[PDB]
């Protein structure tokens with residue numbers, strides 16, 4: 001049996017040994033029967049509801065409602081039983097919708113050596129021991145041990161975050177993911193020419209497979225909003241059970257009938273549970289998701305919308321999220337001395353070259369145009385549809401030529417002698433003849449490292465004429481090279497001439513992987529907002545520090561910690577060091593997970609914005625998983641909870657503001673609904689205690705909570721948010737929703753509603769027996785109390801006149817609909833039969849409005865008193 005070798009094991013053993021265990025053929029390939037057998041055993045080269053709905057019934061509130069329903073059906077109360085059943089079904093469905101995570105969001109074509117080469121093959125068809133070829137712009141299909149690689153470099157930015165392509169060698173290594181120069185791992189593009197290797201791993205055994213297993217092992221933390229709502233539900237369950245028990249035992253001591261106490265406990269348990277709260281919360285979160293979808297962000301779970309409003313730390317993958325991952329020629333330094341700055345980011349025509357504050361196009365400036373032409377002519381990389389097929393620096397030079405408008409200069413020259421780029425050579429030289437005139441002499445264009453180019457150059461150009469090189473000019477060029485190096489740029493020396501050793505030094509170009517457009521401004525805004533932004537990447541110290549300094553995360557006195565130090569550091573000292581530092585470099589996926597888990601240990605709500613495979617574990621471990629919509633890999637977008645469609649960081653600020661507004665609205669309607677529930681519970685308890693018959697039954701309580709107080713609460717959940725709410729710093733997730741002031745307001749509203757409703761109920765009670773007039777008076781009084789409480793519950797600080805009655809059109813429509821429904825209940829004969837109510841005179845309605853305005857008046861009085869006291 002032919003086992004799969006671990007990448008480290010394959011790198012350690014020589015080529016012959018690897019082929020011996022893998023039982024491979026270096027030249028001929030694999031027999032069809034052997035491929036079929038290994039595919040049958042190992043499998044293809046790929047990797048990857050009812051119980052969720054049932055689990056909602058485990059909630060204690062749902063259990064209490066089921067107990068109420070079964071007690072109701074034991075007696076002959078069919079209406080209460082069916083109403084409570086419908087309420088339970090609706091609550092369970094909306095809870096399942098809230099907890100449901102959406103998963104709605106060609107195989108790599110690899111030419112392996114199957115039978116005499118030239119086999120088109122597919123990514124899936126590979127089996128261990130297969131020999132697969134590689135070329136430029138070809139993604140690596142599976143982890144292959146490179147047994148033949150001539151001038152090979154591979155871009156592992158997605159896999160490991162290393163910007164520079166990794167040079168690949170065939171000889172076994174004496175001994176890290178990057179240190180294994182022999183192996184070429186799955187999912188990494190090949191920049192350089194050619195390679196061939198034996199497929200050591202297929203499926204779960206690839207590096208993608210190891211990171212996927214790490215991701216699956218991890219469990220995503222629960223959102224702060226979900227924790228707060230679970231705590232609130234536990235508090236409500238304890239309160240309801242305690243109140244029901246105390247009332248039951250007290251009344252039994254008083255001597256009330258057992259059947260009467262059961263038929264009253266049904267109403268008590270229905271009232272004490274706010275049924276509309278989960279529905280309203282789910283609807284609010286769904287509207288937030290829709291708004292984010294409008295704002296170029298796809299949220300995969302409803303509670304995630306509020307989560308970015310509570311985040312304290314935002315982490316970031318440097319390569320591909322903060323930086324475009326596309327090299328750009330930022331700076332040009334002419335040999336004469338002219339300084340030019342180049343805008344634009346990536347491989348595209350957008351942007352322009354600015355010289356001394358003046359935009360230069362075409363051949364306006366002969367020196368910079370000549371430098372651009374020299375860079376563009378001696379290139380192999382070609383850009384199609386803003387995608388690069390070739391070296392990154394050559395693509396950057398092509399993009400610069402595109403910006404200058406000289407992209408049609410590669411066609412004017414045809415190569416005669418080409419000198420390939422080599423690791424020891426460090427310079428590329430090409431001779432061309434101008435197409436229009438063959439009589440023109442041979443002209444050689446060369447580029448590469450400054451040292452070699454200036455060694456092969458003996459003259460330099462200035463003001464349209466050639467001058468002999470001197471020591472002073474070489475010193476100036478060296479100083480400019482040092483200045484560019486200190487700024488994080490990569491320096492290439494461009495030169496042209498008639499033959500090697502007689503070139504005219506043209507200038508220098510500074511190439512850097514630049515931050516994405518608008519990332520700097522968004523980072524500054526987020527830092528000013530109170531969020532501490534950290535950078536976690538697997539790249540080198542120099543590149544990470546340069547990018548961090550450009551974005552502003554890094555200062556002279558700031559500190560940076562490698563991944564190896566993190567591994568060596570103990571849990572405690574890691575917990576003290578991680579908050580201090582802001583840049584982490586050479587961080588493996590396990591190290592990124594360690595960093596985020598140590599941040600979460602201190603209590604911070606961590607959000608990471610990565611795009612690579614190495615960020616999948618970190619994204620799942622993070623409280624918010626943000627991924628780039630376009631550049632993000634399949635695994636990273638699988639581990640994310642929100643994806644930025646346009647790869648814009650302003651979407652992060654929009655999400656933060658939306659989360660803050662959603663939480664504020666949630667607080668408002670939670671206050672309203674708990675006030676209503678406590679008022680109903682207290683009214684029923686007081687009526688039962690003093691021998692009054694129960695004023696409200698299960699059907700009426702459910703009607704009030706859902707039909708009448710539903711639309712007003714789903715209008716309070718969409719109330720426009722004040723600027724001061726979203727301008728506040730991120731809150732502490734340990735804080736509860738029910739503040740002391742909120743509880744005070746809820747108790748005041750409950751007391752007033754109880755007093756008014758009990759007064760009406762007792763006044764209309766003729767001979768301690770409920771008459772339909774009493775039923776309709778109590779029902780309408782409670783509904784009007786609820787409408788006025790909803791009106792006064794729009795904001796905790798701003799008075800309604802300050803806000804405006806007609807500011808929220810949805811609220812006005814919901815209130816009008818509720819009033820029309822109540823009028824139908826008290827006037828429509830079928831509804832009168834259903835609810836055992838009666839028609840009411842206009843004077844009674846006026847009296848009810850006057851009595852029910854007291855809760856609003858007291859609420860605004862308390863608001864004014866609080867405002868005066870705050871000053």
Ligand code: BEF
Pocket residue numbers: 157158160161162317318319320536537538539611612614615
């Ligand atoms: F892509 Be990141 F730099 F890990």
Ligand SMILES: [Mg+2]
Pocket residue numbers: 157158161317318319320321610611612
């Ligand atoms: Mg990345």
